[PDB]
Amino acid sequence: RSVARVYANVNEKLGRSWWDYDNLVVQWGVQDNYEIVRKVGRGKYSEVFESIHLPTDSKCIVKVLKPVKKKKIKREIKILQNLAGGPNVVGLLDVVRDSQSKTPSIVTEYVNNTEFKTLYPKFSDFDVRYYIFELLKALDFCHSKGIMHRDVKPHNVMIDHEKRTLRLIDWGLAEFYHPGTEYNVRVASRYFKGPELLVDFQEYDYSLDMWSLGCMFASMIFRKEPFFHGHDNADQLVKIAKVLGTDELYTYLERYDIDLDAQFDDILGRYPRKPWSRFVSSENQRYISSEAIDFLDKLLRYDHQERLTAEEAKEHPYFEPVRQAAAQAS
Ligand SMILES: Nc1ncnc2c1ncn2[C@@H]1O[C@H](COP(=O)(O)OP(=O)(O)NP(=O)(O)O)[C@@H](O)[C@H]1O
Ligand SMILES: [Mg+2]
Structure with a gap:
């Protein structure tokens, strides 16, 4: 049509x-190497914070997703990893999550x-x-x-x-x-x-x-x-x-x-x-x-x-x- x-x-x-993003296995980063500083944004299914990658002491963005529809999450990651190095596309720094609730975050460039x-x-x-x-x-x-x-x-x-x-x-x-x-x-x-x-x-x-x-x-x-x-x-x-x-x-x-x-x-x-x-x-x-x-x-x-x-x-x-x-x- x-x-x-x-x-x-x-x-x-x-x-x-x-x-085929359903079958992507996410190699989580270390949640504790990031420290959230200040709220910079909000969303329908998210919250966004300015943050520090502690081991480097550097500015970055942490975006905490809503954990349900697990494959909707893998979709966004698979697309970000796929578009790696593309002209004028936001850079993907890490994907981490909370050890207990399993709530994930995407870490991007500030x-x-x-x-x-x-x-x-x-x-x-x-x-x-x-x-x-x-x-x-x-x-x-x-x-x-x-x-x-x-x-x-x-x-x-x-x-x-x-x-x-x-x-x-x-x-x-x-x-x-x-x-x-x-x-x-x-x-x-x-x-x-x-x-x-x-x-x-x-x-x-x-x-x-x-x-x-x-x-x-x-x-x-x-x-x-x-x-x-x-x-x-x-x-x-x-x-x-x-x-x-x-x-x-x-x-x-x-x-x-x-x-x-x-x-x-x-x-x-x-x-x-x-x-x-x-x-x-x-x-x-x-x-x-x-x-x-x-x-x-x-x-x-x-x-x-x-x-x-x-x-x-x-x-x-x-x-x-x-x-x-x-x-x-x-
Ligand atoms: N890399 C970034 N640098 C600076 N600010 C950022 C960055 N990423 C996100 N933000 C801020 O965070 C806000 C929300 O980010 P976004 O990634 O669109 O979350 P969202 O939940 O999907 N919001 P929505 O547009 O309603 O779907 C943006 O409008 C920006 O002000
Ligand atoms: Mg969105």
């Missing part, structure tokens, strides 16, 4: 030793982050092209290794603006992509969910991450956080419909034999396509160019087979300032 455009082969061509609603308004046009390009690098890498993040959003993009470095964190929803598999649609955060998630289409792929990338980018360049502000998961589809249009939605559902749910009959009207240019303001004009709008317009498409691949998106003209800049550094 849908295969991915790119990289569909990958997990088949790497081994079952690459994707990144001196600025929270995005503070940091994003401080970006220049170049910053945006540059940090999106760096993030495209992580997305392309893990996609080319047969993995979907499925929770791309600002909150999982650590930026050390002083170091001009980027890390994609939180692979607790990352699943391996197997052609034709029916994945769970209850993934990603509301404001970054794809239309395929919102209409219960289960045979999605690496293109889901591109719709989310486009939701980030849209809010960066139009200065509208979040860009699609649905009150529930049904309102999410209507808020997207008010921009992309109800015509192109109906052609896409037909293209995929998706039958919309009956709740939508009363809430989903006929909406015309609002051009991207109506989101241009004076406060957000610094980020606007035709390169940018064109690029956003090829991320944010109902049909996931119409979205750019992360590889394709790096080729985009928008990023040419970044390409040539890094080349002249060379």
